[PDB]
Design an enzyme around this catalytic site. Sequence first.
Site, PDB file in Angstrom:
ATOM      1  N   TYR A  90       0.816  -1.205   0.000  1.00  0.00           N
ATOM      2  CA  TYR A  90       0.000   0.000   0.000  1.00  0.00           C
ATOM      3  C   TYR A  90       0.863   1.274   0.000  1.00  0.00           C
ATOM      4  O   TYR A  90       0.607   2.239  -0.758  1.00  0.00           O
ATOM      5  CB  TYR A  90      -0.890  -0.050   1.255  1.00  0.00           C
ATOM      6  CG  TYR A  90      -1.834   1.112   1.425  1.00  0.00           C
ATOM      7  CD1 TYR A  90      -3.082   1.151   0.765  1.00  0.00           C
ATOM      8  CD2 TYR A  90      -1.519   2.143   2.302  1.00  0.00           C
ATOM      9  CE1 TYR A  90      -3.978   2.238   0.988  1.00  0.00           C
ATOM     10  CE2 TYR A  90      -2.383   3.194   2.494  1.00  0.00           C
ATOM     11  CZ  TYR A  90      -3.603   3.243   1.841  1.00  0.00           C
ATOM     12  OH  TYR A  90      -4.440   4.335   2.106  1.00  0.00           O
TER      13      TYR A  90
ATOM     14  N   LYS B   9       0.827   4.166  -2.847  1.00  0.00           N
ATOM     15  CA  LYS B   9       0.539   5.571  -2.501  1.00  0.00           C
ATOM     16  C   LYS B   9       1.699   6.546  -2.730  1.00  0.00           C
ATOM     17  O   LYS B   9       1.481   7.707  -3.039  1.00  0.00           O
ATOM     18  CB  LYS B   9       0.052   5.663  -1.051  1.00  0.00           C
ATOM     19  CG  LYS B   9      -1.346   4.981  -0.834  1.00  0.00           C
ATOM     20  CD  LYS B   9      -2.405   5.398  -1.840  1.00  0.00           C
ATOM     21  CE  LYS B   9      -3.795   5.256  -1.262  1.00  0.00           C
ATOM     22  NZ  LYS B   9      -4.840   5.474  -2.298  1.00  0.00           N
TER      23      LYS B   9
END
Lengths: 293, 285
Positions: free
Chosen positions: B171, B175
Amino acid sequence: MGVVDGRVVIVTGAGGGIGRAHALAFAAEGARVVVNDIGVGLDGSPASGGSAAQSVVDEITAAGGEAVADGSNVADWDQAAGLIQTAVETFGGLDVLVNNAGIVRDRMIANTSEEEFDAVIAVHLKGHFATMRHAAAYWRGLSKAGKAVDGRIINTSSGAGLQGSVGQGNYSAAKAGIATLTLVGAAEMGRYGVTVNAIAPSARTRMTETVFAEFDAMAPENVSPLVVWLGSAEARDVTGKVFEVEGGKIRVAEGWAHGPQIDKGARWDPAELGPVVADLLGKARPPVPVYGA
Amino acid sequence: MGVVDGRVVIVTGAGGGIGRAHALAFAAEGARVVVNDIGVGLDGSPASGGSAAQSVVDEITAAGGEAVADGSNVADWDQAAGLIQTAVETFGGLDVLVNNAGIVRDRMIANTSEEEFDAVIAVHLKGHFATMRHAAAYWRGLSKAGKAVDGRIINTSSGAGLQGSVGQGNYSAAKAGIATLTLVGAAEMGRYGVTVNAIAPSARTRFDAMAPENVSPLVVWLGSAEARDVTGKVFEVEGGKIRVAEGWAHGPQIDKGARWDPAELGPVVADLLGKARPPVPVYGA
Ligand SMILES: [Cl-]
Ligand SMILES: [Cl-]
Ligand SMILES: [Cl-]
Ligand SMILES: [Cl-]
Ligand code: NA
């Protein structure tokens, strides 16, 4: 004695350019090197006889060092696992992983094909993640079994990943993922004796691989000394750092910070935000500009 | 008159949570909204009758707005191209792209499977890039034809992308790619009247400070005509808080003016690190 005497180092994409420079630099300081590169040899298989990897291995052995070629594609999750095993099987263990393999498919975002996005993400970001995944599991396993771990991951980011680079959206995104993955790896793996850092060679550093060879600040060999030092026992207290390098220059990149803040203490009306945003932005630190803007 | 009156906006992953909050917030301020969500309706196909997308569309109409449901999976390149086309064919144009669609598959890096990596990267980073690529090719077209472009892309990054988050390396990487993509998009797309910004909703986001509705007002404002001079910015948002995130900076530097010997770098690195600013810590550390 060499700075990394006896240590076993994998360098990915080590058949030419910066990766080759790292492989030679490590071997010069006493490391046993796994020269990983997908470039095919005469028979068309990766890293076989006649390949760039084998040529670098022969340079190392001719200089009195020890190395072996490996043709794993690090973007292939299982081949990345097998790369870690090559080191362990050939040399008895693994101390340092240098993620360097990369490609460019430079396009404006508006003109980037699916394949041009996919390939750059796969080689850089997936390749770096896959080797980290498998090397960390290896080192964690040694630690669980009471064994000596003083392991090292050195990743390759870029100013393009930190501040962006026009016409290099895909590459910038991948190198940004690599910078942050370095921060997370450092936080997760220090528990079992592994440091995780990155270098960011300057854009002007010579990184392509020409046929003929014969102070050049832009030579790729100038990038490797810090990699070799970070891979050493002495660098045990350095982790989660990103160092920008070119020639004789080393600069520490400082990460994202908390700038100006305002708090309504209630829900904002979108109509009222103009002055609020103007206020915050005038107070914010000027950024390092996007490269190539 | 609404803040984004008449503006045509796409919100991805708009069937629930913050994506839903965005969709409703844009409609409330006069935008015509394409509600993109892959959630299936009663017939088992994405964004049909009985779906999350259509449900939200019904919410918009009943408050007196205009909205259409779209089922495209933005991780699929061709479907992302079709999502742009849906906006243009349905309301005649596109003014705002809000990239929100996201998933988590948390694992320590050492334990991450290939599928956990691939799925997270696909939804977040490929999803974001795909829609930006197709929306930019479209806005670029209009601009090269001498037509009106006052376009807006608002991406969804995270503190995980900025400083990292333990147990979320997948993640965090996705991001981070989004944060830098926002910087590059801003530099490239300003040439044809398109701003590119991101939000990073706080960890604790779900007076209820943690309510997802609290994030939307800045996104609505960023998509507005008034926001024409704001580009390349990353804003951290929670409740009534807005904070500007300040990008990677140049820290201390040393120059030998010759090639370093690896053996001499201990004190050199120690000195540099002694002068370098302490980082904002990795989340979850
Ligand atoms: Cl590269
Ligand atoms: Cl191009
Ligand atoms: Cl885990
Ligand atoms: Cl915040
Ligand atoms: Na020496």
